[PDB]
Symmetry: C3
Subunit: 116 residues, 3 copies
């Protein structure tokens, strides 16, 4: 029942709060209904990026999850995640993409095996 979230951004490392990974973990756990133990998070600052040809702060993100992905859920996650990026990283929400992936258990390895 793994899930993982990655944020790639041009904002500098010093502007990513030290608690941001834990905030994301906790908020995603609540949003997906998964124990936080199952959630992994990866933040990549200082990237060379443009969004719409401009290099104001932006983010390209991905959420890969075994289940809990779908049209309505994804609309809800986008509000959650845009809110977090807007407040903590000062990124305008119209400069964020989030790609959503519903992963089959057989296609997620963990602990020397897969979830299937």
């Amino acid at each position: 029942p793994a899930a993982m979230f990655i944020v790639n951004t041009n904002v500098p490392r010093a502007s990513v709060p030290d608690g941001f990974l834990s905030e994301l973990t906790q908020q995603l756990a609540q949003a997906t209904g998964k124990p936080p133990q199952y959630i992994a998070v990866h933040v990549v600052p200082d990237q060379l990026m443009a969004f719409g040809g401009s290099s104001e702060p932006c983010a390209l993100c991905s959420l890969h999850s075994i289940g809990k992905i779908g049209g309505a859920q994804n609309r809800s996650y986008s509000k959650l995640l845009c809110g977090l990026l807007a407040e903590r990283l000062r990124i305008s929400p119209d400069r964020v993409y989030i790609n959503y992936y519903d992963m089959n258990a057989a296609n997620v390895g963990w602990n020397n095996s897969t979830f299937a």
Copy 2:
């Protein structure tokens, strides 16, 4: 209207020309037929990479797009993008992979919703 392109390479940051992000944005807008406002680009130099076991210059790239992906289109994008990587970054085309992804609109979040 969304598309996003990432290039990961071992070539050094100093060898990425000024204007490269803008060139990628404009060339991708033209190639995909999408307005530049919704094209995002991400260039990641100085990576620890090998291609065929060799650490000569190489790249691993991804193009995620809502539509505009398919057999003939992807061949055209590959000629365009390998050409740019060869000309601008001096990477041989046979040391480049580009993964193409046709994203469902429901699976791309942007500005507090999805594109669905």
Copy 3:
């Protein structure tokens, strides 16, 4: 004949042993049955990451492969790859996710074209 493996980890660059990229290339060629020429590897240390809310050593990885992906194969790759991350990088296997992707040939660009 293409496959590509990325490992993102918080472990420091200096802890990645000399030859790790070569070992990954060789072992992935053996495991997938593909010529080593077409195996690409990408190792990304020093990342800002958490797994289950802990920032102890962890990894998020992906294997994209034209074929050679499936239930039994992915279990085998996970045992191989988690074993390598444990032995070489000292990452507990229960702090690793590996996402597996079976790529269509038409969706992998290489050498100014695609594999389709």
